[PDB]
Design a protein around this ligand. Structure first.
Ligand SMILES: *Cc1c(COP(=O)(O)O)cnc(C)c1O
Ligand SMILES: *Cc1c(COP(=O)(O)O)cnc(C)c1O
Lengths: 417, 417
């Protein structure tokens, strides 16, 4: 039946039409939506490989069915590289998503109905970290802890509510506009209660990978991350652990399979193995340093133009722009910048007068533009254009003026050259 | 950074080595492991597309973030084709796996701790259908129902245990060696108790797609399936429903997102849309008829050679070979046929004297060989070779004799020509 050509575009016309229109969009839009990144052509071509036909159920070396003698090596490379890169003695590259990566931890260490002191969803919290609409909040009792006025973690507030409710696990996952997390302090608090320390570094994986952001793995029980964000990866999940007992490692192993999922996607795992090797390169370090370098350069521009930035400056690669004083909503800023081909997302400010859906502020990330080839001089130029739109918010002529400059710089700096 | 070449093999040597060794294996091994199939090059090339960079969270037409104007069309094509093909007015192509596809149904319609009358795991039952090691059995109370001696469903036994325990949902998923399921009878039983009717046709999706196997969708509440088995698809899940209320459709919609998973894999969904179009072709029908035609031809050979086949003959594309009378174990039959490059899996027989891990029998499927180009004359030849190995089970010369013939027929009939 299979003649080994069937080009995606001689059979299905309308699907290819929509496929290439998205390709044009990505080549003509500035992506400043937080922690979104472009992946390697090595990953793409490994993801679209013949390994999608292979059904391997279980773990390498101890599979159920025969003929898994070669795919065990493919997965082991992804495991061994994950261990060496983040300095862990445990790695799991089978979870389909970051939501599934977290799901395993809850089913392994927690009973249905246990008190979990997770980060507040209303103030930058993740869905899998405790949400009424998510499985995490429905099955488990969630008691939220809040951050301080600037955005940094109140360590005295975390020590409280710990004796009041006595949680079995505390979630110290990274959220928006928050600075560095003292994970050494997290362990001291968790040990006094007798609770598990769970840290989700999904958002800041690439920065820890190069050595720009502190590593939570050395002093945490279970650490989860996405392989497709600040690490430039296939879309998936990862479970890492350091300094634990083998009886606790097999808890997480059983939590993935046969916990919540069946056979892992080997074509994605092949893309995971190559992506980790690219992160080990010295060229990945210079890129990741330039990500934080561009983030700082942008904050300088917004402050000089009279726009308030949360926490004064940026710690990593994310910064939130306050628009309360300018009397503008984040929904109106999103649509205005969206028309000028600048992709930003609306975000709620601390002490927001307006609806959490109207947001009165915007969130800007820098990993997508740095991957393209934007330097400090290009990052300040783009930040200058954004302020031009925010000044004349309803002037249509100004929006078209910026878009033309955006279309030019996208033509000068392509994603895939 | 990205120079738009980075061939998978000039950077990572050992990964490509393992990748091509699996490609050689698949081209030199006869796959008779049940319901495993080779996918289209259209799917592979759409799975390894630039759509992996796109982050679209939510549902088409009502996304959270801007710039999702084109990916809504990509997903809608996968939805519209899924509806028309299986005759449903509801489709969901976002679930990452069949385990996640089932997970949504349980979280949407059932409370944690509800009595569920699912199929017996010990006798052909699926893991997500009620298993002590799986999330389905841990969160929900599972009461198992068993099949009759031949393998067909005891309808009187299903009517019992329904008043004894009063379940809120009954699972009528397809299992091994079972014939046709009277799904019209399933509805009559479920309505009397006031329970949801959940049918998993994952294993027999392609046969229903062509019109060889009866369709459970017209008379069932919720129907789930994998898009990567007897349908020749990207590895994923699908939720279908027909004749329900909109308040029950939005239960399943919320069950996927923000139920158990975040943003869907758009590169896989693009592969899902093209795979459904290929199933609509008249050439897919003639293939699927030839799948059942080869299954019947093989049973004829095994019966003439004095080997017992469960249920007398095959109903669809799966048949189980009994080896109790021959005094051979399914573990020894697996290893012997495995060395002759025949990939079969060990399976337990009804009333098994030996361990469920030693299995005293084997399970053979026919969708992989039919996809390659095997007809009735080629299917009977292969079945003849299998019996030659089972007759002289410890004779090493015979095993090498068959392998040579297997290597020849694989060279004559390639997967991707
Ligand atoms: C079919 C199947 C699944 C579905 O996902 P796979 O990719 O096929 O693993 C899950 N578990 C079992 C036991 C299956 O047979
Ligand atoms: C990061 C993220 C996830 C992880 O999976 P995606 O593919 O990025 O969707 C899940 N939910 C939310 C809200 C996320 O930000």
């Amino acid at each position: 039946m299979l003649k080994r050509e069937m080009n995606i575009a001689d059979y299905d016309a309308e699907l290819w039409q929509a496929m290439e229109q998205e390709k044009v969009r990505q080549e003509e839009h500035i992506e400043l939506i937080a922690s979104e990144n472009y992946t390697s052509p090595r990953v793409m071509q490994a993801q679209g490989s013949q390994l999608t036909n292979k059904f391997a159920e279980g773990y390498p070396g101890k599979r159920y069915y025969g003929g898994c003698e070669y795919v065990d090596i493919v997965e082991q490379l992804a495991i061994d590289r994950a261990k060496e890169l983040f300095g862990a003695d445990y790695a799991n590259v089978q979870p389909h998503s970051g939501s599934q990566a977290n799901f395993a931890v809850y089913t392994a260490l927690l009973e249905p109905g246990d008190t979990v002191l997770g980060m507040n969803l209303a103030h930058g919290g993740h869905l899998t970290h405790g949400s009424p609409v998510n499985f995490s909040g429905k099955l488990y009792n969630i008691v939220p802890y809040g951050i301080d006025a600037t955005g940094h973690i109140d360590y005295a507030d975390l020590e409280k509510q710990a004796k009041e409710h006595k949680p079995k696990m505390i979630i110290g996952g990274f959220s928006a506009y928050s600075g560095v997390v003292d994970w050494a302090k997290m362990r001291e608090i968790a040990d006094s209660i007798g609770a598990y320390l769970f840290v989700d570094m999904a958002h800041v994986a690439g920065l820890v990978a190069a050595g720009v952001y502190p590593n939570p793995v050395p002093h945490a029980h279970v650490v989860t991350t996405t392989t497709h964000k600040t690490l430039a990866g296939p879309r998936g999940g990862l479970i890492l652990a350091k300094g634990g007992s083998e009886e606790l490692y097999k808890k997480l192993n059983s939590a993935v399979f046969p916990g919540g999922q069946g056979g892992p996607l080997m074509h994605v795992i092949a893309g995971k193995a190559v992506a980790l090797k690219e992160a080990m390169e010295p060229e990945f370090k210079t890129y990741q340093q330039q990500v934080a370098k561009n983030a700082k350069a942008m904050v300088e521009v917004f402050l000089e133009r009279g726009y308030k930035v949360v926490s004064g400056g940026t710690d990593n690669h994310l910064f939130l722009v306050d628009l309360v004083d300018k009397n503008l909503t984040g929904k109106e800023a999103d649509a205005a910048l969206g028309r000028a081909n600048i992709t930003v997302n609306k975000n709620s400010v601390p002490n927001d007068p307006k609806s959490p859906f109207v947001t009165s502020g915007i969130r800007v990330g820098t990993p997508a533009i740095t991957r393209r080839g934007f330097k400090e001089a290009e990052a300040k130029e783009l930040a200058g254009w954004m302020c031009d739109v925010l000044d004349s918010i309803n002037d249509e002529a100004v929006i078209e003026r910026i878009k033309g400059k955006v279309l030019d710089i996208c033509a000068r700096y392509p994603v895939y050259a």
